[PDB]
XYZ file of C-alpha atoms in Angstrom:
716
model
C 118.012 83.159 83.691
C 116.488 85.424 86.280
C 115.118 88.928 86.047
C 115.865 92.435 87.310
C 115.708 93.057 91.041
C 115.251 96.636 92.220
C 116.949 98.310 95.239
C 115.079 100.375 97.808
C 117.006 103.686 98.536
C 116.569 106.926 100.461
C 118.781 110.009 100.315
C 118.012 110.772 103.901
C 119.544 107.500 105.113
C 123.042 108.947 104.888
C 121.901 111.953 107.055
C 120.439 111.536 110.509
C 118.575 114.851 109.882
C 114.821 114.811 108.824
C 115.128 117.284 106.071
C 118.031 119.288 104.281
C 119.950 121.691 106.160
C 119.991 124.052 103.162
C 116.377 124.839 102.268
C 114.570 127.971 101.454
C 110.839 128.610 101.205
C 109.884 130.824 98.272
C 106.306 131.693 97.502
C 105.087 132.872 94.104
C 103.460 113.039 93.417
C 101.416 113.707 90.345
C 104.437 113.510 87.960
C 108.248 113.775 88.952
C 111.412 113.434 86.798
C 115.173 114.083 86.862
C 116.784 116.039 84.090
C 120.286 115.584 82.894
C 121.693 118.906 81.594
C 124.668 119.684 79.277
C 126.481 120.900 82.301
C 126.328 117.098 82.961
C 124.563 117.568 86.460
C 121.337 115.769 87.347
C 118.662 118.040 88.883
C 115.540 116.317 90.267
C 112.049 117.901 90.462
C 108.826 116.580 91.869
C 105.357 117.866 91.436
C 103.256 116.949 94.423
C 100.554 118.063 96.936
C 97.941 118.414 94.114
C 99.905 121.014 92.357
C 100.720 123.317 95.161
C 104.346 122.060 95.464
C 107.275 122.154 93.021
C 110.124 120.550 94.815
C 113.511 121.093 93.346
C 116.448 119.456 94.967
C 119.756 118.553 93.279
C 120.232 114.782 92.740
C 123.769 115.274 94.192
C 122.552 115.732 97.719
C 120.317 118.478 99.023
C 122.881 119.498 101.748
C 125.371 120.861 99.234
C 122.721 122.812 97.191
C 119.753 124.730 98.176
C 116.410 122.894 98.385
C 113.944 125.293 96.693
C 110.319 124.690 97.237
C 108.278 126.777 94.924
C 104.902 126.933 96.411
C 102.220 127.713 93.763
C 99.140 129.739 94.937
C 96.828 127.490 92.939
C 96.441 123.963 91.611
C 96.513 123.424 87.829
C 93.498 123.851 85.566
C 92.588 120.303 84.336
C 95.415 117.608 84.320
C 98.721 117.396 86.048
C 100.521 117.011 82.589
C 100.257 120.809 81.984
C 103.771 121.176 83.297
C 106.859 121.264 80.995
C 110.353 121.559 82.460
C 113.405 121.790 80.127
C 116.732 123.733 80.397
C 116.812 126.845 78.251
C 119.842 129.073 77.689
C 121.577 127.912 80.901
C 118.492 128.763 83.053
C 116.075 126.200 84.037
C 112.804 127.087 82.345
C 109.776 125.962 84.235
C 106.284 126.501 82.631
C 103.174 125.998 84.655
C 99.450 126.647 83.699
C 97.606 127.872 86.897
C 93.941 128.004 87.870
C 93.361 131.806 87.745
C 94.043 132.228 83.942
C 97.820 132.899 84.091
C 101.009 131.322 82.540
C 103.837 131.019 85.083
C 107.469 131.316 84.015
C 110.162 130.485 86.554
C 113.793 131.106 85.876
C 116.087 129.342 88.314
C 119.786 129.965 87.701
C 121.733 126.800 87.794
C 123.991 128.304 90.427
C 121.044 128.758 92.855
C 120.088 125.016 92.455
C 123.537 123.517 93.157
C 125.068 126.048 95.585
C 123.664 126.492 99.108
C 125.535 129.654 99.157
C 122.811 131.302 97.112
C 119.492 132.423 98.266
C 117.642 134.613 95.770
C 114.624 136.820 96.194
C 113.455 138.583 93.208
C 113.881 137.956 89.389
C 113.043 134.274 89.711
C 109.425 134.541 88.632
C 107.362 136.397 86.192
C 103.691 135.808 86.016
C 102.008 137.039 82.817
C 98.937 135.983 80.796
C 98.866 134.985 77.086
C 95.160 134.047 76.932
C 92.780 133.491 79.858
C 92.771 129.801 80.570
C 89.709 130.091 82.922
C 87.618 130.409 79.729
C 88.754 127.715 77.264
C 90.225 124.795 78.829
C 93.889 123.750 78.687
C 94.469 119.982 79.309
C 98.026 119.634 77.755
C 101.180 121.648 77.727
C 104.012 120.734 75.295
C 107.326 122.601 74.909
C 107.975 122.113 71.113
C 111.295 123.971 70.495
C 113.497 126.501 72.181
C 111.129 129.300 71.338
C 107.711 127.633 70.653
C 105.257 125.872 72.919
C 101.720 124.688 71.982
C 99.053 124.521 74.559
C 96.325 122.100 73.455
C 92.733 122.775 74.436
C 89.921 120.324 75.454
C 87.403 121.898 73.070
C 90.058 121.806 70.335
C 92.372 124.420 68.944
C 96.135 124.889 68.735
C 97.674 127.964 70.580
C 101.297 128.682 69.989
C 103.132 130.843 72.455
C 106.280 132.319 71.027
C 109.313 133.242 73.323
C 110.612 136.714 73.626
C 113.762 137.675 75.548
C 114.470 134.081 76.644
C 111.840 134.090 79.351
C 108.391 135.505 78.647
C 105.594 134.344 76.248
C 103.495 136.390 73.893
C 100.354 134.660 72.200
C 100.577 133.997 68.331
C 97.183 133.029 67.001
C 96.657 130.210 64.529
C 93.484 129.924 62.383
C 92.220 126.597 63.597
C 90.053 127.532 66.643
C 86.887 125.641 67.502
C 83.480 126.980 66.448
C 83.738 125.453 62.934
C 85.388 122.196 63.977
C 81.817 121.203 64.528
C 80.304 122.818 61.508
C 82.027 120.494 58.961
C 80.372 117.273 60.379
C 77.410 116.177 62.551
C 77.742 113.259 65.076
C 75.702 112.682 68.137
C 77.562 110.356 70.419
C 80.734 112.183 69.634
C 81.933 115.838 69.849
C 85.711 115.264 70.219
C 86.012 114.192 66.634
C 87.600 117.332 64.919
C 88.528 118.957 68.211
C 92.083 118.592 68.839
C 92.124 117.310 72.404
C 95.639 115.940 71.761
C 96.671 113.525 74.483
C 100.186 112.782 73.295
C 102.647 113.979 70.766
C 106.188 113.771 69.607
C 108.103 115.919 67.176
C 110.205 114.540 64.223
C 112.805 116.513 62.297
C 111.669 119.574 64.365
C 109.257 120.268 61.513
C 106.434 117.753 61.683
C 104.398 117.200 64.923
C 102.785 113.828 65.006
C 99.642 114.217 67.303
C 97.312 111.567 68.706
C 93.849 112.759 69.636
C 91.460 111.287 72.249
C 89.863 108.999 69.592
C 93.449 107.825 68.780
C 93.396 108.792 65.104
C 97.057 109.543 64.174
C 97.023 112.993 62.475
C 100.281 114.514 61.109
C 100.442 118.179 61.001
C 103.402 119.978 59.585
C 103.401 122.992 61.918
C 105.999 124.870 59.818
C 102.913 125.930 57.758
C 100.117 124.680 60.318
C 98.535 122.396 57.860
C 97.151 118.935 58.232
C 98.977 116.761 55.798
C 97.869 113.283 56.599
C 95.079 111.492 58.496
C 95.123 107.801 59.482
C 92.046 106.082 60.919
C 94.016 103.783 63.243
C 91.089 102.212 65.128
C 89.906 98.966 63.493
C 87.451 96.183 64.231
C 89.732 93.343 63.233
C 93.155 94.473 64.340
C 91.456 94.758 67.648
C 88.444 93.400 69.446
C 85.816 96.184 69.510
C 83.785 94.240 72.099
C 86.567 94.924 74.470
C 87.242 98.599 74.758
C 87.959 101.251 77.418
C 87.837 105.149 77.302
C 91.100 107.088 77.484
C 90.634 110.760 77.978
C 93.556 111.495 80.278
C 96.793 113.152 79.285
C 99.710 110.864 79.608
C 101.882 109.125 76.941
C 100.180 107.045 74.079
C 102.752 107.876 71.356
C 106.349 106.776 71.747
C 108.947 107.802 69.122
C 112.577 106.656 69.118
C 114.664 106.914 66.120
C 111.867 106.964 63.397
C 109.999 103.907 64.894
C 106.587 104.827 66.388
C 104.507 103.085 68.769
C 100.843 103.844 68.919
C 98.642 102.421 71.699
C 95.033 101.762 70.464
C 92.351 101.867 73.229
C 90.726 98.778 71.611
C 91.377 95.542 73.512
C 93.396 96.385 76.715
C 96.055 97.976 74.550
C 97.491 97.280 71.063
C 101.096 97.966 70.223
C 100.931 99.051 66.458
C 104.597 99.419 65.271
C 105.289 101.623 62.193
C 108.018 103.700 60.609
C 107.837 107.448 59.948
C 109.429 108.291 56.630
C 109.134 111.417 54.437
C 107.797 110.513 50.972
C 108.199 112.884 47.918
C 106.371 116.248 48.130
C 107.684 116.745 51.674
C 104.826 114.747 53.172
C 105.684 112.512 56.178
C 103.830 109.198 55.709
C 103.172 106.450 58.336
C 103.934 102.970 57.352
C 102.445 100.145 59.300
C 104.718 97.255 59.951
C 103.147 94.953 62.400
C 100.494 94.856 65.188
C 100.868 92.875 68.284
C 97.702 91.963 70.133
C 97.815 91.481 73.780
C 95.708 90.389 76.656
C 95.943 92.019 80.142
C 94.291 91.024 83.363
C 92.738 93.470 85.827
C 89.839 94.146 88.165
C 89.389 97.897 87.536
C 91.174 98.152 84.136
C 95.010 98.571 83.771
C 95.808 102.133 82.662
C 99.193 103.012 81.240
C 101.345 105.599 82.883
C 104.123 106.017 80.475
C 105.573 104.149 77.605
C 109.234 104.768 76.494
C 110.797 103.176 73.341
C 114.585 103.098 73.740
C 117.714 101.191 72.680
C 118.352 97.610 73.714
C 118.570 97.160 77.477
C 120.358 94.342 79.175
C 117.914 93.368 81.911
C 118.104 89.769 81.570
C 117.363 89.529 77.746
C 118.213 86.866 75.321
C 117.594 88.554 71.855
C 116.776 92.376 71.427
C 116.440 95.038 68.794
C 114.372 97.449 70.800
C 112.776 97.551 74.281
C 109.485 99.141 74.851
C 109.160 99.839 78.645
C 105.521 99.858 79.790
C 104.343 101.092 83.138
C 100.886 99.943 83.902
C 99.043 100.959 87.128
C 95.586 99.977 88.358
C 94.953 100.444 92.103
C 98.171 100.545 94.188
C 99.596 97.818 92.034
C 102.058 98.811 89.528
C 103.276 96.245 87.104
C 106.463 97.187 85.321
C 106.858 94.919 82.299
C 108.989 95.213 79.370
C 108.005 94.160 75.897
C 111.285 93.198 74.424
C 110.997 92.908 70.690
C 113.937 90.730 69.573
C 113.786 91.304 65.937
C 113.164 93.772 63.050
C 109.988 91.930 61.951
C 108.693 92.736 65.478
C 107.080 89.249 65.580
C 109.452 87.535 68.013
C 109.058 88.959 71.454
C 109.205 88.040 74.960
C 107.843 89.578 78.016
C 110.557 90.227 80.487
C 108.920 90.610 83.847
C 110.149 92.995 86.618
C 110.956 91.121 89.790
C 110.149 93.558 92.548
C 112.295 92.159 95.404
C 114.782 94.517 97.038
C 117.521 93.747 99.410
C 114.766 94.335 102.154
C 112.589 91.382 101.044
C 115.350 88.778 100.651
C 116.695 89.721 104.101
C 113.308 89.554 105.734
C 112.737 86.170 104.060
C 115.887 84.452 105.147
C 118.022 86.546 107.476
C 115.307 87.433 109.832
C 117.396 87.591 112.957
C 119.302 90.805 112.173
C 117.416 93.707 113.770
C 115.952 93.314 117.192
C 116.319 89.583 117.013
C 120.062 89.688 117.561
C 119.451 90.738 121.244
C 119.796 94.244 122.697
C 116.879 96.559 122.186
C 119.420 99.412 121.861
C 120.951 97.640 118.888
C 117.418 96.881 117.430
C 116.464 100.543 117.530
C 119.610 101.741 115.532
C 119.093 98.881 112.993
C 115.516 100.103 112.292
C 116.835 103.586 111.578
C 119.488 102.336 109.155
C 117.221 100.044 107.041
C 114.500 102.719 106.522
C 115.539 106.429 106.323
C 114.829 109.513 108.325
C 111.596 110.314 106.231
C 109.872 107.001 107.123
C 111.312 107.134 110.585
C 109.857 110.453 111.663
C 106.543 109.771 109.827
C 106.275 106.546 111.845
C 106.493 108.590 115.136
C 103.489 110.628 113.790
C 101.336 107.459 113.191
C 102.260 106.239 116.624
C 100.828 109.455 118.183
C 97.559 109.410 116.301
C 96.899 105.753 117.121
C 98.383 106.267 120.686
C 101.106 103.770 121.332
C 103.325 104.330 124.384
C 106.953 104.246 123.344
C 109.009 101.988 125.486
C 112.144 102.117 123.268
C 115.287 100.802 124.776
C 113.716 98.418 127.276
C 111.027 96.469 125.452
C 111.627 94.209 122.525
C 107.840 94.346 121.686
C 107.866 98.297 120.923
C 110.620 97.568 118.248
C 108.289 94.965 116.627
C 105.464 97.541 116.557
C 107.675 100.148 114.994
C 109.210 97.637 112.494
C 105.734 96.964 111.078
C 105.053 100.745 110.490
C 108.532 101.401 109.050
C 107.423 98.890 106.399
C 103.921 100.199 105.641
C 105.262 103.857 105.400
C 108.370 102.827 103.204
C 106.010 100.967 100.745
C 103.664 104.025 100.285
C 106.625 106.297 99.768
C 108.227 104.001 97.150
C 105.134 103.710 94.833
C 105.559 104.417 91.145
C 104.735 107.890 89.710
C 106.793 107.973 86.497
C 109.668 106.408 84.549
C 112.838 108.406 84.265
C 115.680 106.987 82.261
C 118.732 107.548 84.543
C 121.709 107.913 82.051
C 119.350 107.239 79.147
C 119.448 103.427 79.686
C 119.020 102.202 83.186
C 115.386 101.989 84.237
C 114.748 104.320 87.285
C 111.309 104.663 88.727
C 111.040 108.011 90.494
C 108.582 107.741 93.201
C 105.865 109.485 95.234
C 107.236 112.050 97.503
C 110.709 113.710 97.091
C 113.950 111.927 97.992
C 112.462 108.470 97.095
C 113.730 106.386 94.136
C 113.957 102.695 93.241
C 116.651 101.746 90.807
C 116.742 98.395 89.079
C 119.971 96.560 88.368
C 121.169 93.600 86.069
C 121.796 90.382 87.797
C 125.093 88.713 87.217
C 125.718 84.952 86.796
C 125.622 84.175 90.597
C 122.420 86.137 91.044
C 120.641 84.385 88.065
C 121.490 81.053 89.547
C 120.087 82.005 92.912
C 116.560 82.682 91.613
C 116.978 79.555 89.517
C 117.214 77.563 92.718
C 113.561 78.607 93.372
C 112.927 76.985 89.956
C 115.484 74.323 90.524
C 117.032 74.995 87.065
C 120.499 73.467 86.368
C 123.042 73.571 83.635
C 126.591 72.293 84.835
C 127.868 69.717 87.359
C 128.416 72.528 89.886
C 124.968 74.017 89.458
C 123.476 70.484 90.351
C 125.666 70.159 93.486
C 124.406 73.587 94.941
C 120.757 72.707 94.162
C 121.112 69.506 96.334
C 122.707 71.321 99.227
C 119.709 73.918 99.217
C 117.236 70.972 99.681
C 118.939 69.918 102.944
C 119.251 73.524 104.102
C 115.423 74.378 103.646
C 114.794 71.688 106.217
C 117.086 73.148 108.870
C 115.932 76.184 110.629
C 117.530 79.491 109.616
C 118.730 79.817 113.209
C 120.860 76.549 112.892
C 122.206 77.653 109.591
C 123.692 80.917 111.208
C 125.079 78.899 114.250
C 127.076 76.758 111.729
C 128.132 80.109 110.025
C 129.303 81.491 113.474
C 131.604 78.368 114.218
C 133.108 78.551 110.622
C 134.111 82.263 111.426
C 135.885 81.312 114.720
C 138.335 79.228 112.694
C 139.705 82.410 111.037
C 139.559 84.407 114.355
C 141.041 81.711 116.649
C 138.052 82.159 119.187
C 137.758 78.488 118.570
C 141.458 77.517 118.963
C 143.613 76.839 115.869
C 145.470 74.306 118.135
C 143.102 71.537 116.773
C 143.022 69.938 113.420
C 140.344 71.440 111.268
C 138.622 68.146 111.184
C 138.216 68.225 115.089
C 136.783 71.800 114.896
C 134.214 70.497 112.214
C 133.346 67.742 114.753
C 132.583 70.562 117.320
C 130.089 72.054 114.809
C 128.361 68.722 114.281
C 127.629 67.974 117.814
C 126.515 71.524 118.775
C 124.413 72.516 115.706
C 123.249 69.490 113.683
C 122.049 67.124 116.446
C 118.360 66.426 116.045
C 117.992 68.742 113.172
C 119.611 66.643 110.350
C 117.438 64.548 107.948
C 118.783 60.993 107.664
C 117.204 60.654 104.148
C 118.943 63.638 102.749
C 122.530 62.443 103.931
C 122.302 59.444 101.641
C 120.934 61.425 98.589
C 123.824 63.739 99.220
C 126.377 60.884 99.194
C 125.035 59.573 95.744
C 125.513 63.103 94.231
C 129.090 63.236 95.494
C 129.944 60.006 93.910
C 128.773 61.315 90.452
C 130.548 64.709 90.483
C 134.399 65.193 90.802
C 135.017 67.251 94.021
C 138.257 69.413 93.601
C 137.225 70.383 90.038
C 133.876 71.735 91.275
C 135.503 73.621 94.180
C 138.064 75.466 91.962
C 135.323 76.347 89.561
C 133.176 77.970 92.463
C 135.894 79.925 93.995
C 137.670 81.437 91.066
C 134.632 82.201 88.716
C 131.413 82.323 90.910
C 132.287 84.056 94.181
C 135.206 86.272 92.979
C 134.066 89.275 90.944
C 135.260 90.347 87.498
C 138.675 92.041 87.043
C 137.933 95.576 86.258
C 139.527 98.713 87.518
C 139.552 102.449 86.998
C 139.900 102.563 83.266
C 136.648 100.793 82.611
C 134.372 103.606 83.940
C 134.300 107.374 83.634
C 134.895 109.322 86.807
C 132.545 112.143 87.925
C 133.698 115.753 88.553
C 131.407 116.208 91.493
C 129.888 114.361 94.411
C 126.581 112.392 93.744
C 124.708 110.563 96.617
C 122.389 108.431 94.400
C 125.162 106.392 92.739
C 127.150 105.720 95.937
C 124.124 104.473 97.799
C 122.965 101.926 95.177
C 126.515 100.669 94.715
C 126.809 99.915 98.339
C 123.493 98.102 98.358
C 124.316 96.185 95.063
C 127.698 95.026 96.647
C 125.857 94.147 99.852
C 123.251 92.020 98.110
C 125.845 89.954 96.149
C 127.947 89.241 99.250
C 124.839 88.094 101.198
C 124.237 85.385 98.655
C 127.980 84.275 98.749
C 127.766 84.268 102.654
C 125.038 81.525 102.346
C 126.893 79.622 99.420
C 130.073 79.328 101.439
C 128.015 78.089 104.427
C 126.251 75.432 102.504
C 129.350 73.934 100.809
C 131.642 73.789 103.976
C 128.738 71.929 105.829
C 129.416 68.627 103.913
C 132.774 68.292 105.646
C 130.912 68.512 109.032
C 128.469 65.622 107.968
C 130.938 62.960 106.797
C 134.426 62.336 108.062
C 136.557 63.057 104.992
C 140.313 63.704 104.151
C 141.054 67.387 103.545
C 144.709 67.048 102.434
C 144.119 67.902 98.792
C 140.849 69.783 99.403
C 142.453 71.737 102.177
C 143.713 74.408 99.751
C 140.119 75.188 98.449
C 138.734 75.010 102.035
C 140.978 77.801 103.401
C 139.772 80.193 100.608
C 136.111 79.598 101.383
C 136.784 80.353 105.132
C 138.568 83.550 104.078
C 135.715 84.501 101.592
C 133.094 83.537 104.353
C 134.962 86.056 106.646
C 134.900 89.046 104.381
C 131.292 88.533 103.347
C 130.185 88.332 106.992
C 132.334 91.335 108.079
C 130.647 93.768 105.620
C 127.271 92.866 106.902
C 128.230 93.734 110.563
C 129.720 96.997 109.489
C 126.608 98.027 107.465
C 124.607 97.864 110.753
C 127.338 99.823 112.524
C 126.854 102.615 110.127
C 126.321 102.328 106.345
C 127.294 105.795 105.530
C 130.872 105.650 106.971
C 131.387 102.323 105.275
C 130.459 103.888 101.819
C 133.053 106.738 102.175
C 136.141 104.521 102.429
C 134.979 102.392 99.509
C 134.241 105.230 97.067
C 137.846 106.526 97.396
C 139.594 103.283 96.410
C 137.535 102.954 93.283
C 137.210 106.426 92.045
C 139.878 108.727 90.521
C 138.151 111.735 91.778
C 137.187 110.055 95.026
C 133.561 110.345 96.249
C 130.647 109.785 93.727
C 130.489 108.627 90.081
C 128.076 108.857 87.084
C 126.648 105.916 85.086
C 125.198 105.940 81.549
C 125.690 102.387 80.632
C 125.048 98.879 82.182
C 128.714 97.848 81.623
C 129.817 100.849 83.711
C 127.590 100.076 86.690
C 128.763 96.426 86.730
C 132.514 97.151 86.686
C 132.328 99.548 89.505
C 130.616 96.994 91.820
C 133.289 94.418 90.735
C 136.077 96.930 91.473
C 134.739 97.449 95.028
C 134.354 93.615 95.578
C 138.017 93.077 94.573
C 139.333 95.613 97.026
C 137.537 93.817 100.014
C 139.105 90.508 99.086
C 142.521 92.186 98.615
C 142.249 93.333 102.325
C 143.882 91.339 105.164
C 142.175 89.712 108.172
C 144.447 91.410 110.700
C 143.864 95.056 109.547
C 141.061 96.190 107.378
C 140.661 99.685 105.848
C 137.222 99.863 107.441
C 138.510 98.771 110.855
C 140.889 101.631 110.929
C 138.396 104.293 109.870
C 135.510 103.199 112.119
C 137.816 102.905 115.164
C 139.392 106.399 114.690
C 136.051 108.190 114.038
C 134.089 106.814 117.023
C 136.305 105.376 119.525
C 139.426 107.747 119.563
C 137.816 111.105 118.786
C 134.991 110.089 121.212
C 131.210 109.902 120.435
C 128.162 108.999 122.694
C 127.717 105.447 124.067
C 125.497 104.183 121.172
C 128.333 104.107 118.537
C 130.816 102.760 121.184
C 128.294 99.954 122.098
C 127.445 98.248 118.709
C 131.066 98.733 117.679
C 131.884 96.533 120.651
């Protein structure tokens, strides 16, 4: 099998505008996330510009709710992990520690986030001070419960802030403040030892707060009486290599807790996953039980540092045996490596590392299907194609870089300006899509929210056809059919990609009658040979091909291809839950997931039909199969042409036919996501050649109602 491929996405690729038409500036990425509420609406927030910008936008399009930019007067006072955002009492509670000694409370009514009909000025902020934070240093903020937070200090000490009136905080002192957390020991290369500079914590039973300090001693404090109950020295000189060691002093995630299973990262080696169970023993004392330790060896050049770690339920992301998946986001430099330690069993001793394959739609299309932008002739066409592939945010930013570095724009005349642009569109999209954080979208599907607002990269599960395709770059086989397709790929890597598309073009004419349907199909295949394969074909490969054909039964292989490998699953409305609102994020990714799949089929269909062009063979029994592949070839190619015409209008027709509601959907499970793509794919193949649902919409919108010459011209 293969591995998870991501999808690049922008929410400003649907809109030809730079920025939301509904925005408001209010005035009182480091981390970003998206929070599912019990309203069942996703609201996204990003924390960027070195703590001087909170960006809230609904993840349901920022042009049907108000963008609210809450511009902070000050940057945060040590760390960018002194932010907690959770929904409290049907108001979105935002807590911010600021550099001036204040504690910021914002109350954003849910109505103001998701309606654009709502501007609000006044009663959206209250700034008040529990204890001056320009004195003793906060480095961590944790929201504990719905009326309790603990702000952990860098010189040790626990300060609870208790909630009054559903908004404001009043300080409640605990007796455990530093001065004497340094009078019960000595030490001389240490000073963090009994100071509670807690770098990660998670709360079990809403009673006991399991805290990891800088030293990564796991200390369990029952905070329903503010007593230390248990102390485990976790660091060891034989569960880990002490020669290899790196300091961790930065607030992030080093404890992960899902169900009662805890994961502790030990800063000895280049990480240790120590797996244990949290169980309460008699006398109401939570005890930690070691189970197993897994050593590991990384590979850097400036030391991999973790970002986040999230223990969750079994994920289907090209696994083979699973009990739990521990997602790990490493970053050193501008490389992020997403890898997933899949533990397959309860022992935790059989594991595999499932790697992330970080190839979008963009990379596979640049690698193979290179003539598609400004390489299809017409500079006017090239220019629109650049817009559609990389959104408004990248597009406008690219104009800025052009002005600094002085490039004279000669758009719509010179092919070479489009190449210059194309390069920039790429460097700016990569910077914008870099990893910041993990968010679980729907509590399963691994979403990386990225630097700068309105940027996300979702990863998807590859289906049987998709797994095979990456296993032709490994040349892995496993049926009679799989072997046939692998041979055909060998021959096609020798032909230029330009010839492969010329042969695709002539197969299309057979369905359109632009090559007459007055010939036998065999004569038309002869036309193809002479025009496209002369002085390109390898003589060697023709014979190898003949030997494979003699070993594998033809009609059998062709039925198998058509009915199980190109065609999608049979799933319809009932397999998926339908949303009660519009959502942009889901409809975009579905489009692109459908698109990807059909691009591989477009090439498969090409490669199989080619054999009939090489040799002069009877197609009186195989004629029935052949007709299907020309039909399938058609539909696959058609969608591609339309996507360049305009990808947004093409999504709108599609969403209606699938959805009960029409427009948008929500996903919370991998089965659901899959079914919905399969339902769209079915709908396309159920369409006729003569009238398409797309053809009708696109024509009416541009051509009849009348729009400027650019939409008329590529539509031609």
